[PDB]
Ligand binder design. Sequence first.
Ligand SMILES: [Ca+2]
Ligand SMILES: [Ca+2]
Ligand SMILES: [Ca+2]
Ligand SMILES: [Ca+2]
Ligand SMILES: [Ca+2]
Ligand SMILES: [Ca+2]
Lengths: 89, 91, 89, 91
Amino acid sequence: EEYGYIVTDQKPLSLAAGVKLLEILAEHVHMSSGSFINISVVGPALTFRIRHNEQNLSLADVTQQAGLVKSELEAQTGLQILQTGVGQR
Amino acid sequence: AEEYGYIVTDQKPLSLAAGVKLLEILAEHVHMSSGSFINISVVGPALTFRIRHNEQNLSLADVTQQAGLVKSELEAQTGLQILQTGVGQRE
Amino acid sequence: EEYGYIVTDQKPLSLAAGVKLLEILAEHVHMSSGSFINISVVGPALTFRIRHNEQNLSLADVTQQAGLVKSELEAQTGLQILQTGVGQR
Amino acid sequence: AEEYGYIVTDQKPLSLAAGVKLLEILAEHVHMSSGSFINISVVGPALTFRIRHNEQNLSLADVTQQAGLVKSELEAQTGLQILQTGVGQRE
Ligand SMILES: [Ca+2]
Ligand SMILES: [Ca+2]
Ligand SMILES: [Ca+2]
Ligand SMILES: [Ca+2]
Ligand SMILES: [Ca+2]
Ligand SMILES: [Ca+2]
Protein backbone atom coordinates (compact mmCIF):
# COMPACT_ATOMS: atom_id res chain seq x y z
CA GLU A 1 0.00 0.00 0.00
CA GLU A 2 2.88 2.38 -0.78
CA TYR A 3 2.28 5.60 -2.74
CA GLY A 4 4.41 8.01 -4.69
CA TYR A 5 4.55 11.58 -3.28
CA ILE A 6 5.32 14.98 -4.79
CA VAL A 7 5.37 17.62 -2.07
CA THR A 8 4.81 21.19 -3.16
CA ASP A 9 4.74 24.69 -1.66
CA GLN A 10 0.91 24.78 -2.06
CA LYS A 11 -1.71 25.47 0.58
CA PRO A 12 -3.65 23.53 -0.39
CA LEU A 13 -2.47 21.87 -3.59
CA SER A 14 -5.25 22.02 -6.11
CA LEU A 15 -6.36 18.72 -7.65
CA ALA A 16 -6.18 20.17 -11.15
CA ALA A 17 -2.62 21.34 -10.57
CA GLY A 18 -1.68 17.94 -9.12
CA VAL A 19 -2.87 16.04 -12.19
CA LYS A 20 -1.24 18.61 -14.45
CA LEU A 21 2.05 17.69 -12.72
CA LEU A 22 1.26 14.08 -13.54
CA GLU A 23 0.48 14.92 -17.18
CA ILE A 24 3.86 16.59 -17.70
CA LEU A 25 5.59 13.76 -15.84
CA ALA A 26 3.74 11.14 -17.93
CA GLU A 27 4.87 12.84 -21.14
CA HIS A 28 8.46 12.87 -19.91
CA VAL A 29 8.54 9.17 -18.94
CA HIS A 30 6.51 8.06 -22.00
CA MET A 31 3.55 6.63 -20.16
CA SER A 32 -0.15 7.50 -20.33
CA SER A 33 -1.12 9.72 -17.42
CA GLY A 34 -4.09 7.35 -16.98
CA SER A 35 -1.51 4.94 -15.55
CA PHE A 36 -1.31 7.14 -12.45
CA ILE A 37 -4.09 5.77 -10.26
CA ASN A 38 -5.49 6.18 -6.73
CA ILE A 39 -4.68 9.89 -6.87
CA SER A 40 -5.24 12.24 -3.93
CA VAL A 41 -4.04 15.71 -3.02
CA VAL A 42 -3.44 16.01 0.73
CA GLY A 43 -2.31 19.37 2.04
CA PRO A 44 0.72 20.32 -0.08
CA ALA A 45 1.24 16.77 -1.37
CA LEU A 46 0.17 14.87 -4.47
CA THR A 47 -0.06 11.11 -3.84
CA PHE A 48 -0.63 8.30 -6.33
CA ARG A 49 -0.01 4.71 -7.32
CA ILE A 50 1.00 3.36 -10.71
CA ARG A 51 -0.81 0.81 -12.91
CA HIS A 52 1.21 -1.91 -14.69
CA ASN A 53 3.07 -0.36 -17.65
CA GLU A 54 5.22 -1.54 -20.59
CA GLN A 55 8.45 0.16 -19.47
CA ASN A 56 8.20 -1.25 -15.93
CA LEU A 57 8.24 2.18 -14.26
CA SER A 58 8.03 1.90 -10.49
CA LEU A 59 7.04 4.48 -7.89
CA ALA A 60 10.75 4.94 -7.23
CA ASP A 61 11.39 5.45 -10.97
CA VAL A 62 8.70 8.08 -11.50
CA THR A 63 9.39 10.02 -8.26
CA GLN A 64 13.12 10.05 -9.14
CA GLN A 65 12.22 11.38 -12.59
CA ALA A 66 9.88 13.98 -11.06
CA GLY A 67 12.88 15.19 -9.04
CA LEU A 68 15.07 15.36 -12.15
CA VAL A 69 12.58 17.40 -14.21
CA LYS A 70 11.08 19.40 -11.34
CA SER A 71 11.91 22.78 -12.95
CA GLU A 72 9.98 21.77 -16.06
CA LEU A 73 7.09 20.59 -13.85
CA GLU A 74 7.04 23.84 -11.87
CA ALA A 75 7.29 26.19 -14.86
CA GLN A 76 4.02 24.79 -16.21
CA THR A 77 1.94 24.33 -13.03
CA GLY A 78 2.53 27.50 -10.98
CA LEU A 79 4.01 25.83 -7.91
CA GLN A 80 7.32 24.69 -6.41
CA ILE A 81 8.32 21.05 -5.80
CA LEU A 82 10.10 20.55 -2.47
CA GLN A 83 10.27 16.76 -2.10
CA THR A 84 9.57 13.60 -4.04
CA GLY A 85 9.45 10.13 -2.51
CA VAL A 86 7.52 7.02 -1.61
CA GLY A 87 5.55 6.26 1.50
CA GLN A 88 2.35 5.36 3.28
CA ARG A 89 -0.68 7.66 3.27
CA ALA B 1 20.86 24.57 -1.45
CA GLU B 2 21.72 21.04 -2.56
CA GLU B 3 19.49 17.96 -2.56
CA TYR B 4 19.17 15.93 0.65
CA GLY B 5 17.79 12.47 1.37
CA TYR B 6 15.23 11.98 4.09
CA ILE B 7 13.39 9.30 6.03
CA VAL B 8 10.19 10.23 7.86
CA THR B 9 9.47 7.99 10.83
CA ASP B 10 6.60 7.61 13.30
CA GLN B 11 8.82 8.97 16.13
CA LYS B 12 7.84 12.17 17.93
CA PRO B 13 10.61 13.22 17.88
CA LEU B 14 13.14 10.94 16.22
CA SER B 15 16.21 10.37 18.39
CA LEU B 16 19.63 11.10 16.97
CA ALA B 17 20.74 7.60 17.98
CA ALA B 18 17.89 5.93 16.06
CA GLY B 19 18.37 8.13 12.98
CA VAL B 20 22.04 7.17 12.84
CA LYS B 21 21.16 3.52 13.38
CA LEU B 22 19.00 3.66 10.22
CA LEU B 23 22.04 4.97 8.37
CA GLU B 24 24.33 2.29 9.81
CA ILE B 25 21.97 -0.41 8.57
CA LEU B 26 21.57 1.29 5.20
CA ALA B 27 25.36 1.69 4.85
CA GLU B 28 26.01 -2.02 5.56
CA HIS B 29 23.38 -2.89 2.97
CA VAL B 30 24.92 -0.68 0.25
CA HIS B 31 28.47 -1.73 1.29
CA MET B 32 29.50 1.86 1.97
CA SER B 33 31.03 3.34 5.11
CA SER B 34 28.30 4.98 7.20
CA GLY B 35 30.76 7.87 7.54
CA SER B 36 29.85 8.65 3.94
CA PHE B 37 26.46 9.82 5.18
CA ILE B 38 27.13 13.47 5.96
CA ASN B 39 25.32 16.61 7.09
CA ILE B 40 22.97 14.52 9.25
CA SER B 41 20.10 15.98 11.29
CA VAL B 42 17.02 14.72 13.01
CA VAL B 43 14.16 17.21 13.00
CA GLY B 44 10.78 16.18 14.39
CA PRO B 45 10.03 12.71 13.00
CA ALA B 46 12.54 12.98 10.15
CA LEU B 47 16.14 12.10 9.42
CA THR B 48 17.92 14.16 6.72
CA PHE B 49 21.34 13.51 5.23
CA ARG B 50 23.59 13.91 2.21
CA ILE B 51 26.14 11.54 0.75
CA ARG B 52 29.89 12.09 0.39
CA HIS B 53 31.76 11.30 -2.80
CA ASN B 54 32.22 7.53 -3.10
CA GLU B 55 33.80 5.11 -5.59
CA GLN B 56 30.52 3.18 -5.79
CA ASN B 57 28.96 6.36 -7.27
CA LEU B 58 25.93 5.96 -4.98
CA SER B 59 23.43 8.82 -5.29
CA LEU B 60 20.64 10.02 -2.98
CA ALA B 61 18.17 8.42 -5.39
CA ASP B 62 20.13 5.16 -5.15
CA VAL B 63 20.18 5.11 -1.37
CA THR B 64 16.52 6.09 -0.89
CA GLN B 65 15.54 3.41 -3.40
CA GLN B 66 17.67 0.94 -1.44
CA ALA B 67 16.00 2.04 1.83
CA GLY B 68 12.70 0.99 0.24
CA LEU B 69 14.07 -2.46 -0.61
CA VAL B 70 15.23 -3.06 2.97
CA LYS B 71 12.38 -1.18 4.72
CA SER B 72 11.28 -4.21 6.71
CA GLU B 73 14.87 -4.71 7.98
CA LEU B 74 15.20 -1.05 8.90
CA GLU B 75 11.95 -1.24 10.88
CA ALA B 76 12.69 -4.60 12.53
CA GLN B 77 16.13 -3.50 13.73
CA THR B 78 15.17 -0.08 15.05
CA GLY B 79 11.66 -0.63 16.42
CA LEU B 80 10.24 2.30 14.51
CA GLN B 81 8.06 2.71 11.42
CA ILE B 82 9.17 4.34 8.20
CA LEU B 83 6.40 6.47 6.76
CA GLN B 84 8.20 8.11 3.82
CA THR B 85 11.59 8.13 2.14
CA GLY B 86 12.70 10.48 -0.55
CA VAL B 87 14.86 13.31 -1.85
CA GLY B 88 14.21 16.98 -1.14
CA GLN B 89 15.62 20.35 -2.13
CA ARG B 90 14.70 23.83 -0.96
CA GLU B 91 13.52 26.42 -3.49
CA GLU C 1 29.36 28.34 8.22
CA GLU C 2 31.46 27.47 11.28
CA TYR C 3 31.27 24.01 12.87
CA GLY C 4 32.15 22.51 16.21
CA TYR C 5 34.88 19.81 16.12
CA ILE C 6 35.81 16.93 18.41
CA VAL C 7 38.99 15.27 17.16
CA THR C 8 39.58 11.71 18.28
CA ASP C 9 42.24 9.00 17.96
CA GLN C 10 39.94 7.05 15.55
CA LYS C 11 40.72 5.79 12.06
CA PRO C 12 38.09 6.35 10.94
CA LEU C 13 35.71 7.65 13.58
CA SER C 14 32.51 5.68 13.37
CA LEU C 15 29.30 7.67 12.92
CA ALA C 16 27.59 5.75 15.72
CA ALA C 17 30.46 6.53 18.09
CA GLY C 18 30.40 10.20 17.04
CA VAL C 19 26.72 10.62 17.88
CA LYS C 20 27.19 8.69 21.10
CA LEU C 21 29.74 11.39 22.06
CA LEU C 22 27.06 13.94 21.28
CA GLU C 23 24.47 12.08 23.38
CA ILE C 24 26.69 12.11 26.46
CA LEU C 25 27.61 15.74 25.82
CA ALA C 26 23.93 16.68 25.38
CA GLU C 27 23.07 15.06 28.70
CA HIS C 28 25.87 16.97 30.41
CA VAL C 29 24.87 20.39 29.01
CA HIS C 30 21.11 19.75 29.42
CA MET C 31 20.16 19.99 25.79
CA SER C 32 18.46 17.48 23.48
CA SER C 33 21.03 15.75 21.30
CA GLY C 34 18.64 16.50 18.40
CA SER C 35 19.91 20.07 18.74
CA PHE C 36 23.22 18.94 17.25
CA ILE C 37 22.63 19.28 13.52
CA ASN C 38 24.56 19.04 10.23
CA ILE C 39 26.63 16.19 11.69
CA SER C 40 29.50 14.55 9.80
CA VAL C 41 32.39 12.32 10.78
CA VAL C 42 35.49 13.15 8.72
CA GLY C 43 38.59 11.06 9.35
CA PRO C 44 39.17 11.21 13.12
CA ALA C 45 36.88 14.22 13.60
CA LEU C 46 33.24 14.69 14.54
CA THR C 47 31.81 17.95 13.15
CA PHE C 48 28.43 19.56 13.83
CA ARG C 49 26.40 22.72 14.17
CA ILE C 50 23.93 23.63 16.89
CA ARG C 51 20.22 24.50 16.57
CA HIS C 52 18.77 27.39 18.61
CA ASN C 53 18.41 26.31 22.25
CA GLU C 54 16.94 27.69 25.50
CA GLN C 55 20.26 27.98 27.38
CA ASN C 56 21.95 29.83 24.51
CA LEU C 57 24.75 27.26 24.14
CA SER C 58 27.16 28.21 21.38
CA LEU C 59 29.66 26.08 19.48
CA ALA C 60 32.33 27.56 21.75
CA ASP C 61 30.28 26.62 24.83
CA VAL C 62 29.69 22.99 23.86
CA THR C 63 33.24 22.35 22.57
CA GLN C 64 34.64 23.87 25.79
CA GLN C 65 32.34 21.57 27.78
CA ALA C 66 33.38 18.57 25.65
CA GLY C 67 36.98 19.36 26.66
CA LEU C 68 36.04 19.57 30.34
CA VAL C 69 34.20 16.22 30.42
CA LYS C 70 36.36 14.42 27.84
CA SER C 71 37.24 11.56 30.24
CA GLU C 72 33.54 10.86 30.77
CA LEU C 73 33.00 11.01 26.99
CA GLU C 74 35.89 8.61 26.30
CA ALA C 75 35.01 6.07 29.01
CA GLN C 76 31.66 5.46 27.32
CA THR C 77 32.57 5.57 23.61
CA GLY C 78 35.80 3.55 23.31
CA LEU C 79 37.97 6.34 21.91
CA GLN C 80 40.27 9.18 22.99
CA ILE C 81 39.55 12.90 22.50
CA LEU C 82 42.61 14.87 21.39
CA GLN C 83 41.20 18.28 20.45
CA THR C 84 37.99 20.25 20.60
CA GLY C 85 37.38 23.50 18.74
CA VAL C 86 35.53 25.47 16.10
CA GLY C 87 36.31 25.87 12.44
CA GLN C 88 35.43 25.53 8.80
CA ARG C 89 34.87 22.14 7.16
CA ALA D 1 50.96 16.65 29.14
CA GLU D 2 49.00 19.84 29.75
CA GLU D 3 46.37 21.45 27.52
CA TYR D 4 47.51 23.73 24.68
CA GLY D 5 45.67 26.21 22.49
CA TYR D 6 45.98 26.02 18.74
CA ILE D 7 45.12 27.88 15.55
CA VAL D 8 45.12 25.98 12.26
CA THR D 9 45.78 28.20 9.26
CA ASP D 10 45.81 27.72 5.48
CA GLN D 11 49.62 28.18 5.43
CA LYS D 12 51.85 25.37 4.20
CA PRO D 13 53.80 25.75 6.41
CA LEU D 14 52.92 28.53 8.82
CA SER D 15 55.83 30.91 9.40
CA LEU D 16 57.00 31.58 12.92
CA ALA D 17 56.68 35.31 12.27
CA ALA D 18 53.01 35.01 11.21
CA GLY D 19 52.14 32.69 14.10
CA VAL D 20 53.55 35.19 16.57
CA LYS D 21 51.76 38.03 14.81
CA LEU D 22 48.45 36.23 15.46
CA LEU D 23 49.38 36.13 19.13
CA GLU D 24 50.37 39.81 19.20
CA ILE D 25 46.97 40.76 17.80
CA LEU D 26 45.18 38.39 20.16
CA ALA D 27 47.15 39.74 23.16
CA GLU D 28 46.27 43.38 22.34
CA HIS D 29 42.63 42.34 22.05
CA VAL D 30 42.57 40.58 25.46
CA HIS D 31 44.72 43.36 27.03
CA MET D 32 47.42 40.91 28.06
CA SER D 33 51.14 41.02 27.32
CA SER D 34 51.91 38.79 24.34
CA GLY D 35 54.82 37.52 26.46
CA SER D 36 52.16 35.66 28.42
CA PHE D 37 51.76 33.34 25.44
CA ILE D 38 54.37 30.68 26.17
CA ASN D 39 55.66 27.38 24.79
CA ILE D 40 54.95 28.55 21.23
CA SER D 41 55.53 26.39 18.15
CA VAL D 42 54.50 26.41 14.54
CA VAL D 43 54.12 22.93 13.06
CA GLY D 44 52.81 22.54 9.52
CA PRO D 45 49.81 24.87 9.19
CA ALA D 46 49.28 25.20 12.96
CA LEU D 47 50.29 27.48 15.79
CA THR D 48 50.29 25.96 19.31
CA PHE D 49 50.77 27.79 22.59
CA ARG D 50 50.04 27.86 26.30
CA ILE D 51 49.27 30.77 28.58
CA ARG D 52 51.28 31.97 31.59
CA HIS D 53 49.67 32.84 34.90
CA ASN D 54 47.95 36.22 34.61
CA GLU D 55 45.91 38.50 36.90
CA GLN D 56 43.12 38.59 34.31
CA ASN D 57 42.72 34.82 34.89
CA LEU D 58 42.52 34.23 31.12
CA SER D 59 42.30 30.55 30.18
CA LEU D 60 42.99 28.71 26.91
CA ALA D 61 39.23 28.43 26.46
CA ASP D 62 38.93 32.19 26.98
CA VAL D 63 41.59 33.05 24.44
CA THR D 64 40.42 30.62 21.75
CA GLN D 65 36.88 31.92 22.19
CA GLN D 66 38.25 35.46 21.84
CA ALA D 67 40.17 34.44 18.68
CA GLY D 68 36.79 33.45 17.21
CA LEU D 69 35.32 36.87 18.02
CA VAL D 70 38.19 38.69 16.28
CA LYS D 71 38.76 36.13 13.49
CA SER D 72 38.17 38.64 10.72
CA GLU D 73 40.75 41.02 12.28
CA LEU D 74 43.29 38.22 12.67
CA GLU D 75 42.85 37.29 9.00
CA ALA D 76 42.84 40.87 7.69
CA GLN D 77 46.04 41.79 9.53
CA THR D 78 48.05 38.68 8.69
CA GLY D 79 46.87 37.82 5.18
CA LEU D 80 46.13 34.23 6.10
CA GLN D 81 42.99 32.21 6.74
CA ILE D 82 42.08 30.63 10.05
CA LEU D 83 40.57 27.21 9.53
CA GLN D 84 40.22 26.00 13.14
CA THR D 85 40.86 27.22 16.66
CA GLY D 86 40.66 25.14 19.78
CA VAL D 87 42.22 23.44 22.78
CA GLY D 88 44.08 20.13 22.62
CA GLN D 89 45.72 17.68 25.00
CA ARG D 90 47.67 14.52 24.31
CA GLU D 91 46.46 11.20 25.75
CA1 LIG E 1 12.02 0.27 -13.50
CA1 LIG F 1 11.90 24.96 -8.03
CA1 LIG G 1 5.94 -0.39 8.25
CA1 LIG H 1 26.42 30.82 25.88
CA1 LIG I 1 41.71 10.73 27.36
CA1 LIG J 1 38.17 33.21 6.73
